[PDB]
């Protein structure tokens, strides 16, 4: 005479005194830190910086998506605190789950576009500049909003308030009926919410890794030649000359490997001349002719009296790229595994309430690590900007 009455297979699954106490406490921390954290991000990025880059648009919408999810968070904290009892009705049930699902798909899709933007702004800054305008930045977002809504559309449909017959506990959840709701609901979160975005983000930063590694390896090969060439100028015997000429010959071969991305045949031929000029200098060092080999190595720098500006570069960028990929991986792979197991329990192989408990006990644990590490995404991505860090520390 009202809502749908459901029989629960494993009613005592995930119900523990330590889950009802720790989970709402962590939700309050995520609520306090998330709101205080993300709100200040949207201030600096809009009122202090006026949104003039494409990443600035992605960063603002990334923080607003987290802010929308945090507003519905007080509903889930008390929901867990009441031993999973939902009094908020069916209206807030369809909205709370949709808001959590929408913002989780939107935040991951936004991190995907941010990676594609960094790959374009680094490897091809000149060509991709005219394509990456401010209009495309706002158009990309409304495509993400529509995709995050369409992917979370089954969440607004199959999320009803149910009354368990054998426990008299009214809950808001998904009804995994025997047959006659799609099982692809849990799959979409695994492939569209993790697999597909991770393979695109990893490919972007890996291509940035290989692009920056080639640039720094080439920069260090020239540094290897110039530094060793100054050792010949201050050399004494033929042993100290051959030791430096042997290191320069390997550096010329390593620099011959780098190739961005007839023009490249001229690049490698320019180093075959370099290696060839090192061979003759090595021939004089093997015979024991120091002052003659010193002139052969000094004629090498004939192509080069004003000191020029040095190329700025950081060796710590690889720590950032690796941390960015791992911080996204190890923050969703706990929730993605226990969700994949749920798909096996949903309609398949697993028929045991003893292991269905470890799924419902560790699910809010994985939701907290997914929620806490995602609500800090716009903050830490923003700290990677020298201009953003200065304004944020002033507030």
């Amino acid at each position, epitope marked *: 005479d009202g809502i749908k009455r459901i029989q629960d297979d494993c009613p005592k699954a995930g119900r523990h005194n330590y889950i009802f106490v720790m989970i709402p406490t962590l939700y309050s921390i995520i609520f306090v830190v998330g709101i205080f954290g993300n709100s200040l991000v949207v201030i600096v990025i809009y009122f202090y910086m006026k949104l003039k880059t494409v990443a600035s648009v992605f960063l603002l919408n990334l923080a607003l998506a987290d802010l929308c999810f945090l507003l519905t968070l007080p509903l889930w904290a008390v929901y867990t605190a009441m031993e999973y009892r939902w009094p908020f009705g069916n209206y807030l049930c369809k909205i709370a789950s949709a808001s959590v699902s929408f913002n989780l798909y939107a935040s991951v899709f936004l991190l995907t576009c941010l990676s594609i933007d*960094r790959y374009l702004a680094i490897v091809h*800054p*000149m*060509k991709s500049r*005219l394509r990456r305008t401010m209009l495309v930045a706002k158009v990309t977002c409304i495509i993400i909003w529509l995709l995050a809504g369409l992917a979370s559309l089954p969440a607004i449909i199959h999320r009803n308030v149910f009354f368990i017959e054998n426990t008299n506990i009214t809950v808001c959840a998904f009804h995994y009926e025997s047959q006659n709701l799609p099982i692809g609901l849990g799959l979409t979160k695994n492939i569209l919410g993790f697999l597909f975005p991770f393979l695109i983000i990893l490919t972007s930063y890996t291509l940035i890794w290989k692009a920056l590694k080639k640039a720094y390896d080439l920069e260090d090969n020239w540094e290897t030649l110039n530094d060793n060439l100054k050792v010949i100028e201050k050399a004494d015997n033929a042993a100290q000359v051959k030791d430096a000429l042997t290191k320069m010959r390997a550096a010329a071969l390593d620099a011959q490997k780098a190739t961005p991305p007839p023009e490249m045949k001229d690049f490698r031929h320019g180093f075959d001349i370099l290696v060839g000029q090192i061979d003759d200098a090595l021939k004089l060092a093997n015979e024991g002719k120091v002052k003659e080999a010193q002139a052969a190595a000094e004629q090498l720098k004939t192509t080069r009296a004003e000191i020029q*500006k040095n190329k700025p*570069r950081n060796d710590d960028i690889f720590k950032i790229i690796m941390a960015i990929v791992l911080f996204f991986f190890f923050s969703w792979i706990p929730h993605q595994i226990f969700t994949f197991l749920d798909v096996l329990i949903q309609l398949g192989i697993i028929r045991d309430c003893r292991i269905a408990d470890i799924v419902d006990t560790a699910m809010p644990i994985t939701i907290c690590i997914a929620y806490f590490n995602n609500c800090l995404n716009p903050l830490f991505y923003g700290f*990677l*900007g020298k201009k953003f860090k200065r304004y944020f520390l002033q507030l």
Partner: nanobody
Framework: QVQLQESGGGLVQAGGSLRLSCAASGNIFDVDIMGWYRQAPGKERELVASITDGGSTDYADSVKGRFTISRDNAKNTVYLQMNSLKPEDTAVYYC????????????????????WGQGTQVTVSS
């Protein structure tokens, strides 16, 4: 801020030649990549050419064979040798560059590590 001083644009006969120089100022370190963009009246901006700090150039199909770009790493100045200036080359030629900070984390929400110039008008009369 990194400013880009441009010079060499003016009214010139069709089929002649012109050289555009763009020097970078206010940059403590070297400039990563520099290039040239032109804005035709009533059109959108177009990439003319670009050159890497190592010497790799990339021209557009609009100026192949007639335009040649080079750079001086000592002066951080790029030259756009525009030979056989056709009346279609009449546009506002902007200078572009990519400059990274001292310890550069390749994230920039203020300028995106991309700096423009004032621009010079290059009018080609026939």
């Amino acid at each position: 801020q990194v400013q880009l001083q441009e010079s060499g644009g003016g009214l010139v006969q069709a089929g002649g030649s012109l050289r555009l120089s763009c020097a970078a100022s206010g940059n403590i370190f070297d400039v990563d990549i520099m290039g040239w963009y032109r804005q035709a009246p009533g059109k959108e901006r177009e990439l003319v050419a670009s050159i890497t700090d190592g010497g790799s150039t990339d021209y557009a199909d609009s100026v192949k064979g007639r335009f040649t770009i080079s750079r001086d790493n000592a002066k951080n100045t790029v030259y756009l040798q525009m030979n056989s200036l056709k009346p279609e080359d009449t546009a506002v030629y902007y200078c572009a560059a990519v400059a990274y900070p001292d310890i550069p984390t390749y994230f920039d929400y203020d300028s995106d590590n991309f700096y423009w110039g004032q621009g010079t008008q290059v009018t080609v009369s026939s």
